Amino acid sequence: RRKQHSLLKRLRKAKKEAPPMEKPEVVKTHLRDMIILPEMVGSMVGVYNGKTFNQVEIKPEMIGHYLGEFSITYKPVKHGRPGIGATHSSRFIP
Amino acid sequence: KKSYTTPKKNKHKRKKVKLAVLKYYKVDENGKISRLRRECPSDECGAGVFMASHFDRHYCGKCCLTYCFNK
Amino acid sequence: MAVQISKKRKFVADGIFKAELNEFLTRELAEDGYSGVEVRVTPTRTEIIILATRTQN
Amino acid sequence: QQLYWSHPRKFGQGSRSCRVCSNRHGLIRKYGLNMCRQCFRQYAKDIGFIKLD
Amino acid sequence: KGGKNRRRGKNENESEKRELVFKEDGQEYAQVIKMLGNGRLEAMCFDGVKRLCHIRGKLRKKVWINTSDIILVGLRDYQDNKADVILKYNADEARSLKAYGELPEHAKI
Amino acid sequence: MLMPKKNRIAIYELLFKEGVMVAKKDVHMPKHPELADKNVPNLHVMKAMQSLKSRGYVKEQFAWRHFYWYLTNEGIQYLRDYLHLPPEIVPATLRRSR
RNA sequence: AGGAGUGGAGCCUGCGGCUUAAUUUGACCAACACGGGAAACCUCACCCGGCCCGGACACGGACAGGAUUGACAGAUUGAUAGCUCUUUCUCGAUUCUGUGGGUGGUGGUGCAUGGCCGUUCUUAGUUGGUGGAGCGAUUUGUCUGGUUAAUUCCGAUAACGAACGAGACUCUGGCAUGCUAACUAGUUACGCGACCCCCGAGCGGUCGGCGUCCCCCAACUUCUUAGAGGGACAAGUGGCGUUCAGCCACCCGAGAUUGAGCAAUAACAGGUCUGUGAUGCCCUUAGAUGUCGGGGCUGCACGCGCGCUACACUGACUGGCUCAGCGUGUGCCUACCCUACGCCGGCAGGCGCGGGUAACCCGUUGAACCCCAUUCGUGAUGGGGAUCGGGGAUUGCAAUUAUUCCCCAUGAACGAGGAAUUCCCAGUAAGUGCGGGUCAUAAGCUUGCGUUGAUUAAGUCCCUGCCCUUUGUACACACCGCCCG
């Protein structure tokens, strides 16, 4: 416990106060590191990427893993149309 | 490297309100001095300073991490 | 006051003292006709012979 | 003011610093260097070395 | 070019990218119609009026303006038929301007 | 503050006694060992000498990440009156060098 | 003439293009495993959030019922940043506020510069004085010839006498039973006593053999170590040359070349403002280009470069035998070294003790290829180990886009490689391991070192390129030139 204190109290707290048969709002984090645990389950957590808080519901099937595996931090990728110098042919103009 | 882009908030440091000073000692008759709330009990405190009358919270401002009664 | 560093490291630390001084002085005695130094440790005493042309200034 | 200004630097390339001005990038330790390779050259004449090979 | 030499005695370069005047008063966007020689060139303005465009100092042999493509042209204060080139853009820059909806949506690249 | 009023004295008095100060360029010094003993947790030496230097009264060298401040006659007069000292005292040095 | 490869295949890494909120940036023979640049954080210049001033000094303003400082809790917040707000104590001339003025910047400009480095250029080139020759730009000296690795010498001579580079020099290798001297280096000799086997003559003792302890007030310095010296000079002989300068063969023997360091004139719009508290000018400077948290430099339908591992029988696999060298190591930077020995575990590893400032301890460095004996059998095979699932350890504040290491399982391309192309002449190429560098954890990289050790040449100007002379030129931004319809 190196001031993971801040997270684990908010989760239990928000889970308690929330109506029955309804999930809480969110607790947010810039921390992408913390083991998913049984007690954490049922909460909803937003996880900072570089700008964006991608929200996720915690399953009992996610236990053992980290938070940061369920939020990506890049666009998967598309292409493309090779550019100009994209080879030993691009050159000349005047 | 390039110049700062516009915010829509920024505010620096609060002005730490311009309260009237020393009414903490009450005079109704002399030589009597009618003290209000208790003066701070720590060894490192001088006990010449007042404690906050901050009810539902009771806190020495000379202290800055310790000695917070609340009842 | 001990112990004492390795013989290899003994020469390096002497070189660092010889060099740092020689650029410290050059930034103050430039107008006085600086020309170098010559250090000598002697029995229970340091000598730092501050060579310059005009000892007056 | 603030309650922080620092965070653990205890190992790595940021907890040692080289003697140019507190320059880096140019990772250096050798035989008790703490001395920057660009200036090491300028101290070839100065004492520590004279070039012979 | 294809490498060669003597092309480094002089100031490499490049367009570290960048941005973006307009139009201004008598200073607007045109498209290259033809590609004469000697130096001058043709370019129909985007409004509807034709004109004949002229190259400008520096941009001389420092920037090639192939045929077909948007380009920034000042109009001469008094002359109608002849007009004066400025400030070209990039093909990417021209399609961003088109997507914004500031130049007329008529020409393809 | 800028710094306490205690820690001013402890620099200005120490300078008067040796006739010279020296320090290192850091901002993570924890208590500043190597005199001023364990009551300067920050810049304070460098920050106070610079203001003093602006108004003359001292000269400053710098070489291989170390300052060197040399007190001068004008600052001796200032510091003497500023710290309410005898009209003729210099404990820094006063003898002929042979 | 040949040797081994690259280009082909899988993988690592750098570069381009594409993508992206950011995928920071320099560099295009003389860039591209290069910027010590193997980036978890830091680094960090980039992107997104939050905080701080570390805005000197001057002048004016504020101002001792006072300029000002900090903070609990609650709310807010990634946050336990009094950051903000609620709440109300605390600090006391250090300040705050306005103007003037500074300061910081991995901000820009290497086409404003210093310094350094690379390259032209590893070739033999380069210059002034006085005299001579020309109206002058210039030229002679600096050469027809012989000779050398070399503007190296001989010789010629309107030039004469000189300087820089070449050489000389420094380091390293190769030759010492000569010299100098050694328990932080050895050898020999016994004194030995102890262990061991008769193993050989003899009996087991002794004599001889095997190492270790014992070794000294023993003897010595061959081996090891490092100092002073000597030795190689074309010296001698035979050919050849003007018989000059030199060249070839041979004796002695270490043959006149073992390998490196240092290196001229003049130049380049070569690289570096991101090594520099080197530096001009410009920009920015509180809503900061100066600090904490998170992400990225690793993102892929593609193109190229440097390398690593392979395609088996001259092999793989499992046992057995037996040899080395250059170094390095805690007491350093801020928290950290190299390891013997004992114990526990299949392994990674854990744990208990001890030594090492180092010819003293690790380490008589008990390394690999190689060597000796089993097993496999021409089969994409047990060759190859890519891809991929599960589990165990170590470093750290943190290991996810798997830091590294280990165990079991999974078992791909690849069966000798087009057009092209690189590098190399003797302990050299090639095979093979090790130390140092970066390093909290980690080399497929780079820099050095040992070990095993060939084939082919003793040449030439064909290609590519360079030096000197002569010649031609519409060229001098110098043929990557100029110029015509």
**CA-CA distances (angstroms) from residue B33 to A26, B27, B37, B48, D41?**
55, 6, 13, 14, 78
CATH code for the domain of D33: 4.10.830.10
- The answer as to whether E58 is a domain residue is yes
**C1' (G307) to CA (D41) span, angstroms:** 31
CA atoms in the 13 A half-sphere facing the CB of B27: 4
CA atoms in the 13 A half-sphere facing the CB of B31: 0
Q: Are C24 and D53 within 8 A, CB to CB?
A: no
> Residue written as tokens 């006694």?
F17
Given the DSSP bridges, would you call strands A27-29 and A44-48 parallel, antiparallel or unpaired?
parallel
CA-nearest residue of chain A to E65?
A94
**C1' (G150) to CA (C5) span, angstroms:** 52
Beta carbons within 8 Å of D53's beta carbon, 6+ residues apart: none
**C1' (G364) to CA (D33) span, angstroms:** 35
The shortest C-alpha distance from C16 to chain D (Å) reads 8
CA B36 to CA F35: how far, in whole Å? Answer: 46
Query: Taking the domains of chain F in order of start, what are their residue ranges?
Result: 1-98
3-state secondary structure of F5: coil
All residues of chain F having their beta carbon less than 8 Å from the beta carbon of residue D21 are: 65
| Cα E98-E78-E66 angle, rounded to 5 deg | 40
Angle, helix F73-82 to helix F6-18, in steps of 10 degrees: 130
Q: Which chains touch C (3 or more CB pairs under 8 A)?
A: D, F
Resolution in A: 3.6
C24-37 burial string, b = 16+ CB within 10 Å, else e?
A: bbeeebeeeebeeb
All residues of chain C having their beta carbon less than 8 Å from the beta carbon of residue D32 are: 9, 12-13
Q: Which nucleotide is nearest to B36 (CA to C1')?
A: G89
Q: Does D21 touch chain C (CB under 8 A)?
A: no
- The answer as to whether E2 is a domain residue is no
Q: Which chains touch F (3 or more CB pairs under 8 A)?
A: C, D
Boundaries of domain holding D11? 1-53
Q: Are A67 and A31 within 8 A, CB to CB?
A: yes
Q: Are A32 and A71 within 8 A, CB to CB?
A: yes
> Residue written as tokens 């920057």?
D36
A22-45 burial string, b = 16+ CB within 10 Å, else e?
A: eebebbebebeeeebeeebbebbb
- The answer as to whether E38 is a domain residue is yes
CA A48 to CA A32: how far, in whole Å? Answer: 7
Beta carbons within 8 Å of E18's beta carbon, 6+ residues apart: none
According to the 3-state scheme, what is the secondary structure of chain A?
CCCCHHHHHHHHHHHHHCCCCCCCCCEEECCCCCECCCCCCCCEEEEECCCCEEEEECCCCCCCCEHHHCCCCCCCCCCCCCCCCCCCCCCCCC
CB pairs < 8 Å spanning C and F: 11
Give the class (CATH, top level) of C7-57: alpha beta
CA C53 to CA E98: how far, in whole Å? Answer: 77
**CA-CA distances (angstroms) from residue F12 to A81, B27, F31, F43?**
70, 45, 17, 15
Q: Which chains touch A (3 or more CB pairs under 8 A)?
A: E
CA A7 to CA A26: how far, in whole Å? Answer: 11
Beta-carbon neighbour count of residue C12 at 10 Å?
Answer: 15
Q: Does F98 touch chain C (CB under 8 A)?
A: no
Give the class (CATH, top level) of F1-98: mainly alpha
**Strands of chain B, DSSP E:** 25-26, 34-35, 58-59, 68-69
CA atoms in the 13 A half-sphere facing the CB of A41: 10
3-state secondary structure of B50: strand
Tell me if D32 and C9 make a contact (CB, 8 A cut-off).
yes
> Which structure tokens are listed for B50?
């007042």
CA C5 to CA C14: how far, in whole Å? Answer: 12
3-state secondary structure of B68: strand
Closest CA to E46 of E25, E70, E67, E22: E70
Instruction: State whether the Cα torsion E64-E70-E74-E76 is positive or negative.
Output: positive
Q: What is the DSSP string of chain C?
A: ------HHHHHHHHHHHHHHHHHHGGGTSGGGTB---EEEEETTEEEEE--BS-S--
Tell me if A94 and E3 make a contact (CB, 8 A cut-off).
no
The minimal CB distance from D46 to the residues C8, C11, C19 is found for C19
3-state secondary structure of B69: strand
**C1' (G363) to CA (C20) span, angstroms:** 39
Q: Which amino acid is at C9?
A: R
CA F16 to CA F79: how far, in whole Å? Answer: 8
Q: What is the DSSP string of chain E?
A: --S-SS-SSS-------------BTTEEEEE-----SSS-EE-EESSS---EEE--SSHHHHS---SSSEEEEEPPSS-SSEEEE-----HHHHHHHHHHT-S-TT---
Q: Does D21 touch chain F (CB under 8 A)?
A: yes
Q: What is the DSSP string of D1-53?
A: --S-S----SSSSSS--BTTTTB-SS---TTS--S-HHHHTTTSSSTT-----
The minimal CB distance from F28 to the residues D6, D19, D21 is found for D6
The shortest C-alpha distance from A29 to chain E (Å) reads 36
Instruction: State whether the Cα torsion F9-F14-F16-F19 is positive or negative.
Output: negative
> Which structure tokens are listed for A7?
């997270």
Tell me if A93 and E2 make a contact (CB, 8 A cut-off).
no
Partnered with residue F70 across adjacent β-strands are: F20, F59
> Which structure tokens are listed for E9?
């005695």
Cis amide leading into B31 (omega within 30): yes
CA-nearest residue of chain E to A94?
E64
Closest CA to F49 of F18, F21, F79, F81: F21
Beta carbons within 8 Å of F63's beta carbon, 6+ residues apart: C20, C23, C24, C27
Angle, helix F6-18 to helix F45-54, in steps of 10 degrees: 70
> Residue written as tokens 């001395």?
D35
3-state secondary structure of F6: helix
Q: How far is CA C12 from the centre of its chain?
A: 14
Q: What is the DSSP string of F32-88?
A: --SSSTT---SSTHHHHHHHHHHTSSEEEEE-SSEEEEEE-HHHHHHHHHHTT--SS
State the Cα torsion E59-E65-E71-E76 to the nearest 10°: 50
3-state secondary structure of F9: helix
Boundaries of domain holding E86? 15-109
Of F1, F43, F65, F66, which to mutate for an interface test with D (greatest number of D Cβ within 10 Å)?
A: F65
Q: How far is CA A75 from the centre of its chain?
A: 13
CA-nearest residue of chain C to F70?
C28
Counting every residue written for chain E, the total comes to 109
**CA-CA distances (angstroms) from residue D51 to B34, B48, C23, E27?**
87, 73, 21, 67
Q: Which nucleotide is nearest to A26 (CA to C1')?
A: G78
Q: Which nucleotide is nearest to A35 (CA to C1')?
A: G400
Annotated binding site of D for Zn(2+): 18, 21, 36, 39
> Residue written as tokens 């000695």?
B67
3-state secondary structure of F13: helix
> Which structure tokens are listed for D30?
């050798």
Closest CA to B34 of B20, B24, B45, B49: B24
The domain tally of chain D equals 1
All residues of chain A having their beta carbon less than 8 Å from the beta carbon of residue E1 are: 91-94
3-state secondary structure of F17: helix
CA atoms in the 13 A half-sphere facing the CB of A24: 22
Give me the phi and psi of C50, to 5 degrees please: -90, 85
Which H or E element spans position F24?
A: strand F20-24
Chains B and C lie in contact, requiring 3 or more CB pairs less than 8 Å apart: no
Beta-carbon neighbour count of residue E80 at 10 Å?
Answer: 10
**C1' (G484) to CA (E36) span, angstroms:** 22
> Which structure tokens are listed for B31?
């030589």
